[PDB]
Design a protein around this ligand. Sequence first.
Ligand SMILES: CN[C@@H](C)C(=O)N[C@H]1CN(C(=O)c2ccc(N)cc2)c2ccccc2N(Cc2c(OC)ccc3ccccc23)C1=O
Ligand SMILES: [Zn+2]
Length: 82
Amino acid sequence: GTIYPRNPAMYSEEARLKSFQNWPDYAHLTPRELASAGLYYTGIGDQVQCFACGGKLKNWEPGDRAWSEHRRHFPNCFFVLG
Ligand SMILES: CN[C@@H](C)C(=O)N[C@H]1CN(C(=O)c2ccc(N)cc2)c2ccccc2N(Cc2c(OC)ccc3ccccc23)C1=O
Ligand SMILES: [Zn+2]
């Protein structure tokens, strides 16, 4: 194919959801929201990563939305654009 996800295993939303087992208690965004936006937990801090583009996102602020931050930093991501 003409595109390729950075992390094929994390193609699955359920796999992304499971990655949040040890998501920090200070991290306010829900694993549901984050997984839905293509993001899984890297195991470091509040840093997640997109399965598709491989972009990372961390240091989440109140008012942040997963999709909106994904699109702001990584607007040409095929998951964003799909
Ligand atoms: C308010 N909403 C939150 C989600 C937010 O916008 N957080 C910032 C914080 N952030 C960092 O924490 C950061 C990134 C790289 C780095 N060397 C140091 C700090 C960023 C800083 C500058 C540009 C982009 C980011 N990025 C995205 C980002 C990048 O944006 C293109 C690039 C590299 C990144 C590496 C690790 C984590 C994030 C990276 C953020 O997610
Ligand atoms: Zn992406």
